[PDB]
Amino acid sequence: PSFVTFRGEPAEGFNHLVVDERTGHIYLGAVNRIYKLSSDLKVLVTHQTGPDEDNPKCYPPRIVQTCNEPLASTNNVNKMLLIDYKENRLIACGSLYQGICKLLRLEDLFKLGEPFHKKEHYLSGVNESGSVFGVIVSYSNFDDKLFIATAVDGKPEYFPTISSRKLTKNSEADGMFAYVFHDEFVASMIKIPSDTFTVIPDFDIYYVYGFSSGNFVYFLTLQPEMVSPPGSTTKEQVYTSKLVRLCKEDTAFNSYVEVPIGCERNGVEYRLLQAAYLSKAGAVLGRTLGVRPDDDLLFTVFSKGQKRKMKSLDESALCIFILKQINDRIKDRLQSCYRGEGTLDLAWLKVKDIPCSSALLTIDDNFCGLDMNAPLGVSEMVRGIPVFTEDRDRMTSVIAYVYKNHSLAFVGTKSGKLKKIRVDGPKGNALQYETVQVVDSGPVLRDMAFSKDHEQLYIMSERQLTRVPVESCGQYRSCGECLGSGDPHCGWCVLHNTCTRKERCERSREPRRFASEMKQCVRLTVHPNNISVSQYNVLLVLETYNVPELSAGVNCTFEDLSEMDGLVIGNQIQCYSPAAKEVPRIITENGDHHVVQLQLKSKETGMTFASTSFVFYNCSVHNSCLSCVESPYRCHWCKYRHVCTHDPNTCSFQEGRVKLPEDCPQLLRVDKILVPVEVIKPITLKAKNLPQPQSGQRGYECILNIQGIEQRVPALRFNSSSVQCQNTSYSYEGMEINNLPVELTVVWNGHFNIDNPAQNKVYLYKCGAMRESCGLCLKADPDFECGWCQSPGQCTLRQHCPAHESRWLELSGANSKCTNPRITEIIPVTGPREGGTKVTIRGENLGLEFRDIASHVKVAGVECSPLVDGYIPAEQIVCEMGEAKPSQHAGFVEICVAVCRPEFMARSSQLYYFM
Amino acid sequence: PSFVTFRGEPAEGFNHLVVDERTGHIYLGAVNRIYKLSSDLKVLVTHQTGPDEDNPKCYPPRIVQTCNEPLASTNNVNKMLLIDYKENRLIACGSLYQGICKLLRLEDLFKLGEPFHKKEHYLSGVNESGSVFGVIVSYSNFDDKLFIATAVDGKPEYFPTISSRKLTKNSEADGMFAYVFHDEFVASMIKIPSDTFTVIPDFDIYYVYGFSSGNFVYFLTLQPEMVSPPGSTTKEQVYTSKLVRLCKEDTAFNSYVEVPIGCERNGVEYRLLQAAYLSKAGAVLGRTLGVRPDDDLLFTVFSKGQKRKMKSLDESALCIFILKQINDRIKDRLQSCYRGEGTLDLAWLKVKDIPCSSALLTIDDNFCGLDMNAPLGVSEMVRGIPVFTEDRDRMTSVIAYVYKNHSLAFVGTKSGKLKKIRVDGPKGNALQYETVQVVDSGPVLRDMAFSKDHEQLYIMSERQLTRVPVESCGQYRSCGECLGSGDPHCGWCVLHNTCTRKERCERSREPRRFASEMKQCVRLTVHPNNISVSQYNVLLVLETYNVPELSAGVNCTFEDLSEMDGLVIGNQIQCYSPAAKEVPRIITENGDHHVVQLQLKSKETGMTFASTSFVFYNCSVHNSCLSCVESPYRCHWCKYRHVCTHDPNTCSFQEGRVKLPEDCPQLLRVDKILVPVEVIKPITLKAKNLPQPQSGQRGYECILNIQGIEQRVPALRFNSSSVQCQNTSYSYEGMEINNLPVELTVVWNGHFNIDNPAQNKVYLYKCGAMRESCGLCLKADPDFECGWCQSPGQCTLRQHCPAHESRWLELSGANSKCTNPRITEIIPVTGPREGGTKVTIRGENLGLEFRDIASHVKVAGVECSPLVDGYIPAEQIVCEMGEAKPSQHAGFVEICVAVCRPEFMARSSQLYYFM
């Protein structure tokens, strides 16, 4: 699903947002533009407030008087936006006019009026958006007004930072934005003193948030370094975030109060307000908080430290203030001043500290302020209760609301994401979900308002407004998953088999109709978890917990494949398995088994809610004993029937059943089976649980799978654990390879192949195609049993050579003198006369021991000394030649095995050359 | 009733049968099959032993080693079958494997094992069934074995004819069929010597029957010509049937003994064993035999002569051997050898005769044999006691058992019949019954076993097994018939009125409850055997012998018709006859009398057991005196009442009674009653015992039954023996026939007809319709009294013709000259001129004597001589004509009676023609 949004109609910019309580129309302040949108975020109307030729430096703007300074077309930023329901209009205060305010008609955005003429009509030079805030308070006629705070930019004479102003009925009327009570001595406004400007050049008050409570007006503000941090002269500026308050009723402005505010987390300081939101707790939070229903609360967001208001730190914390607690702090402070203790301590306002005067008074919450001990500051900074802290991504904005008594908090992030937090200090827990309806790359603004119906939450970005629903639980398929996510909005509507909010679930109020906690689910179990393919229409019992009354009716659906009716008794559901006709359609090609998700389809909703792992196995498919028993499931093998089945009874008879893998029938391995070609030899075998062939059944045979020829030799089964193929000889054609492993299969009764787990094979091995010389044969492995036969002048097994004499010669254990050494080739063909060369000689029939070859090697006359490590017996000799200074130049290489006997010597085909 | 049977399940073949002592299950060896059947002969299980590819010539069969000779699918014949109870299995030794044996599980026929590998595992090449036999003997572990004899077929090196072999617990075990004690010098086996084979080529030992007795093992065998019959060189083979024995305990095989056996009947020799059966005598046979209870007996069957073992002779005899007698013969023989006298004399075994060595020894029955005077033969052939001989149909098999101490013997026949013989040498008698349960066309096999319960006897044929009950007495309706049949099983269960065995009769043990001999019956008599129909509820006394106590109550049932209660007194039963209302329902239409089978219906059983001939007569039905007295029964006739009755008193009065047939009243015959029509004549009659008519009774009349007219003439009874109808004339209309016999009935008092046994009739005779001439009338019988009357020119009785003159002419005795001869026709119309022809002249009124006709005949002029024999007076003349040479050619025939007077001559109507 996608979230409904409004792209910066002026793609160019965006600043403030507000919702009309009755209509749901959304008004959006922006630079050069003010838009009226539908609840859906469709564009209703666009107003052009923008680009005006102007100059910030000029006082009474160009229209009133001529300005020496040059003008340029500049952008008019919507500083503030406030809905005046009574007046049926919108106060949309801009800038770039010296801050002239505009009045737009509610429905059409028709400009009712925009008073420019008088000085009061000008609010502030300040170009920055959001640095201003305020509240509109109204009563019936002859009772009314507007409270607004703004930054000065060092304009102290021109504009007041905080003021109480008049809002006349007629937009045309001159009176607008006039101070409620103006006296030569005191006016309902607060200006910044010139002295304070000189001391600290830049001092300015930026107003972030503001709200009316009970009968007062509060502002969250940011100020400069004044005694904080201490500093003799100007240098760096750090800010202190404070709370301000006024009686609505005080024309005098005596009620002004100002406490610093912040909160700390494990020794980390969070001093700077990003945003705030006044709200209600609802029954849950209020109770543990210890509040009355009416009592208010203030969620806030603060960044770490005192540094860089322009660009704050990522570290940010969401804190909380109970209004009762702040009211107490203020009352506590006042009751103290009335004690006469200490000074007023408000640095920016009063440079010279005036003392507090003691007096008899009943100090109440109602206290509006008096002439003496006039505007005052505060010493003890008020600490707030921390809630959630984000280190990686800074929180920008916040909102909250009461839902079914649980308090949900919304928090914008620098990333363009919203967090949905259930505050559970008073309850018990944390953050439920996070969403990126907004804008994936870059942030969200403080103006974040819930709709009137409270279905959605409009989230504003620099670029776009996004209608983020306070829920999209539908994404969750199962009770287990729904309750699993934890985003507090979601619950499992049992009968509907869907995941949504309480309001959405019909009849959720009724018992067990709606599930909040996983325990309430859905958990399902089937008693016959595994059913064989062969079986049909088996009775199954279903155990389900945390489900609503099913009396509407339920069907069992194994999958999309089938569906069977069920009857309910007790706390169980009884359904039947599918027919054999139906079951195999599924099973085919899945083989061993197929796990299927058996679901329950409710009659009323018609959607599958609950599932379980259901296995269709089916033992019968197994072709062999090993697969049947040895496999992963409970299956029994019938030796006689030679079939695998679940039921013991189905087997031929009692003695026939195979429960254990050892009992199958399988062939055990013995030392490797060596088989010479052309020799008559028996092959004894060992095995286990070999069956005695029953009536109508034949005996055992050994089948050798040789590609050239497959041999069928009958065998005898001596007992349950031994077999033997009868005397026979085997061969393969080709003479290609010495050792050929061959798969062998033991069969009985013609087709029945006994299992061969090890997959034992028979090695058919075949005498010197390779070796013409006696030395080479005796050199070869003793395993081959191949040996040299003197009369033939050839080499073969004893079997192969006739014995006129008692002996054919085999190296008994190397104690066998032989013959005819030959040199195939040697490396380094050439060498230096000086010697030292390593000659590598490769031959066929050399000596078996190193000791004999040593002293044997000679290159011509030159003595050559062989290397032990380098020497590979009868194959190769590595030898190092000595000093060659002799006259020969080139000479043949000679090796004398033990002794230079005439039969015993070998000379190289090509000569070694000295250079 | 039909006998339960099992048809050759393989319709194809059958060989051996055995019964399990506990279960009663019947196992049946066959070619290619071994079956397990229920007691009822239902098929329990079938095993396929059959058709295997093999060849008899090959030694170790194909499985062990390759055979050059070609194989063919051949049938595997079950040579032997033996139940091994201890092992809970069945040893079913086949052939066609070189005789490998198989082990089948008792209950299911599961093949436990079949050892093929070793030489011992092969029994014999021999394909023939039944030529092998043996016994399984078992003891607890560490004591045990199998003794088996088989034919060799000239295989002497390969197999032993008789052996003592091992039967291990495990069928898988290799050890099976190994010799009990094998030594290089001597093994527990006996082989046939090669020398003996060369001398007689074919010599072979065939083992028919075998059994264990006491602590030995005996075999009945057939062998070849060795010194019998004498012969220098090979030629014909005849066999000698002998007995063999061994100690169970002799591993050495020293105990071997061999006596020839047979028996002779009136100079006829029976040398060849067909079958044998060891059994017990029971008290009856044993006593007269002179035996102890434990002592055994051996029934056997032998064919006549020494010839053709393959196909023996029909003549066969059932003989007997008492084991004590054979044991004596053996002991007698041994005690003799120990004397040192003579040689061992065993031709086939020892070619060169070794002498017997004398030694001191206590010669007992226990004697197992010693090293010296080692295996030995026997000189004196042991003769057996003959029992039954069948000339026409050869006995094949035998079995016997003890029943109530009487010894019943069973004998199969070539025909497929079983004989049930009580052996009564020790008792006194012969063969009781014969049955064809089996197979009507063709024979029964030696394996014939009684069931465990001994209710039935399974009789095996080549084709089928038949469950023949050792009794079907129910077929017999009466005590007389039951005991009459003689088949020893049957007895008369008196109270039940049924025929069955002793076991079947409830309370037969008690006195006179069961009848064995005819005397014990049932014999019944009724004192009033004959009762008249007229009588009612007559008292009858019943005499019955050989009947049980009737105090239960008895009813008398004449037939299905009625049943009357009876009371018992003394040794008699008193019942009443049926009422007149009841009796005639039966009698109607049976007439003279109805014999009825009066039965006795017992109260307890409710079945009629005893019967007698009971007559319902009834005299009253007889309508006449003759039927009443003259008939077959005692009935009296009342002349006056004219009714027949049993009681003398019922007659009118004393003088009226007719006891004798002569006295009845009947008409006696006199010379035939001749009655002329139209003549007034009296007819006197004679008769006997004619009644004098009593008051209210009229006199006698004669009634003639003439269809034309029936005449009623009154008559007078002169006395008891004479009657006479009054002067009257009779006639019948038609003139069709001369002599008409007529039935006459003599009646008195209107309706009463007197009896006419002779059935005397009156002959009404009537004058020449036929004869126009005087000669013809006088020619006719003198009886007719018909005569010629001159004046009328016609012929009638004197009565019929008026006498003007004193005479009408009648041939007084042929002395009466007459007239007018006529010739109707003559045969041979034509004749030869030469003459010699026999002329046959037929006329009406010729001469009475031959003498006058001779010389009378002439054909024209030609003289013709008449033949005397040929001549029938006045009807026909046969005459031979003389030489015709005269001129006439054709001429008329003339006859002159005496003289050729003008009145007296006749001439032929047509002339005789000469050609």
Structural domains of chain A in order of their starting residue, each with its CATH number: 49-192 (no CATH), 205-389 (2.130.10.10), 390-471 (2.40.10), 479-520 (3.30.1680.10), 523-617 (2.60.40.10), 625-658 (no CATH), 666-765 (2.60.40.10), 823-914 (2.60.40.10)
DSSP A626: I
CA distance linking residue A427 with residue B337, whole number of Å: 122
Q: Is A292 helix (H, G, I), strand (E, B) or coil?
A: coil
User: Cβ separation of B171 and A714 shorter than 8 Å?
Assistant: no
Distance of CA B894 to the CA centre of its chain: 76
Residues A379, A367: Cα–Cα separation, whole Å: 20
- Report helix, strand or coil for B778: helix
User: B715 vs B667, B675, B689, B690, CA distance in Å?
Assistant: 14, 17, 16, 13
Cβ neighbours of residue A734 under 8 Å, at least 6 residues apart? A708
Phi/psi of residue B852, each to 5°?
-75, -40
Contact: A694, B48; criterion CB under 8 Å: no
Contact B126, B150 (CB under 8 A): yes
Q: Which of B672, B683, B670 is nearest to B763 (CA)?
A: B672
Is the previous residue joined to A693 through a cis bond, with omega within 30 degrees of 0?
no
Q: Could you tell me if A726 lies within 8 Å of chain B, comparing CB atoms?
A: yes
**C-alpha to C-alpha distance for B786 and B782, rounded to whole angstroms:** 7
Q: Is B48 on the interface with A (CB under 8 A)?
A: yes
CB distance B756 to B768 below 8 Å:
no
Pairing of strands A72-74, A82-84: unpaired
Tell which residue, B20, B37, B39, has the closest CA to residue B8. Answer: B37
Q: Which of A694, A714, A716 sits opposite B111 (nearest CB)?
A: A694
CA distance B470 to chain A (A): 36
Find how far residue A391's CA is from the centre of its chain.
19
* Residues of chain B contacting A719 with CB distance shorter than 8 Å: 172-174
- Tell me the two tokens of residue B384: 């057996």
DSSP 3-state of B460: strand
Question: Closest by alpha carbon to B411, among B300, B495, B503?
Answer: B300
DSSP string covering A400-425, please? EEEETTEEEEEEEETTS-EEEEE--T
d(Cα B277, Cα B402) in Å, to the nearest integer?
13
Task: Give the alpha-carbon dihedral of A484, A490, A492, A493, to 10 degrees.
Answer: -170
Task: Indicate the residue type of A621.
Answer: V
Q: Distances in Å between the alpha carbon of B193 and those of A636, B163, B197?
A: 56, 15, 7
Q: What is the distance between the alpha carbons of residues A724 and A690, in angstroms, rounded to a whole number?
A: 13
Say how many C-beta atoms besides its own lie within 10 A of residue A709's C-beta.
11
**What residues of chain B lie within 8 A of the CB of A725, using their CB?**
none
Chain-centroid distance of CA A177 in Å reads 55
Give the mutation candidate from B49, B66, B104 for the A interface (greatest A CB count, under 10 A): B66
Q: For the beta carbon of residue A147, count every other beta carbon within 10 angstroms.
A: 22
Rounded Cα distance, B834 and A335, in Å: 212
The token pair at B464 is: 């089928």
H, E, C per residue of B812-855: CCCCCCCCCCCEEEECCCEECCCCCCEEEEEECCCCCCHHHHCC
| Residue A828, C-beta contacts closer than 8 angstroms, at least 6 positions apart | A837, A838, A839, A840, A912
Q: Return the closest-CA partner of residue B55 out of B80, B39, B72.
A: B72
Picking from B532, B602, B512, B604, the residue whose alpha carbon sits closest to that of residue B566 is B602
CB contact under 8 A, A695 and B49: yes
Strand partners, A878: A840
Query: Cβ of A719 and B108 within 8 Å?
Result: no
Structure tokens at A10: 């002026």
Inter-chain residue contact A653 with B49, CB threshold 8 Å: no
The sign one gets for the Cα dihedral A580, A585, A586, A592 is positive
Residue A608 to residue A167: CA distance in whole angstroms: 61
Distances (CA, A) of B661 to A650, B629, B746: 97, 6, 18
- How many angstroms separate the CA atoms of A273 and A309, rounded? 9
Query: Which A residues, 626 through 665, put their C-beta within 8 Å of a C-beta on chain B?
Result: 653
Secondary structure class of B644 (helix, strand, coil): strand
**Helix (H, G, I), strand (E, B), or coil: what is residue B380?**
coil
State whether residue B33 sits within 8 Å of chain A by CB: no
Angle at Cα B449 formed by Cα B444 and Cα B454, nearest 5°?
130
Check CB contact of A139 with chain B, cutoff 8 Å. no
Tally of CB atoms within 10 A around A882: 16
Tokens 């004058």, located at residue:
B767
- Region class of B22: left (phi > 0), else alpha (psi between -120 and 50), else beta: alpha
Strand arrangement of the beta sheet that strand A657-658 belongs to: A643-645, A636-638, A657-658
Say yes or no: A716 contacts chain B, CB-CB below 8 A: yes
> With contact defined as beta carbons under 8 Å apart, do B520 and B607 qualify?
no
Q: What is the resolution of this structure in A?
A: 8.5
DSSP 8-class letter at B604: T
CA-closest candidate to residue A390, choices A457, A303, A321: A303
The set of residues, in sequence order, having a beta carbon less than 8 Å from that of A853 and lying 6+ positions away, is A846, A847, A866, A871, A877, A895, A897
| Residues of B with Cβ-Cβ distance to A695 under 8 angstroms | 47-49, 104, 109-111
Judge whether A720 is closer than 8 Å to chain B, CB to CB: yes
Q: The tokens 């019968």 sit on which residue?
A: A620
Residues of A in contact with B47 (CB under 8 A): 695
Strand pairing partners for A190?
A162
* Coil vs helix vs strand at A161: coil
- Say yes or no for a CB contact (<8 Å) between B47 and A695: yes
Distance, in Å, from the CA atom of B249 to the CA atom of B510, rounded to the nearest integer, reads 49
Stated length of chain B:
915
Residue pointed to by tokens 């003769």: B383
Residue B174 to residue A718, Cβ atoms within 8 A = yes
One-letter amino acid at B178 equals: A
- Chain A residues 674-703 with a CB less than 8 Å from chain B: 692-696, 699
- Number of A/B CB contacts below 8 angstroms equals 33
Contact A372, A250 (CB under 8 A): no
Query: CA-CA distance, A377 to A191, in Å (whole number)?
Result: 16
Under DSSP, the state recorded for A693 is P
Torsion angle of alpha carbons B587, B589, B594, B598, nearest 10°? -50
A713 Cβ partners below 8 Å, 6+ apart?
A701, A702, A704, A725, A726, A728
| Contacting residues of A for B108, CB less than 8 Å apart | 653
Measured distance CA(A321)–CA(A381) in Å, rounded: 13
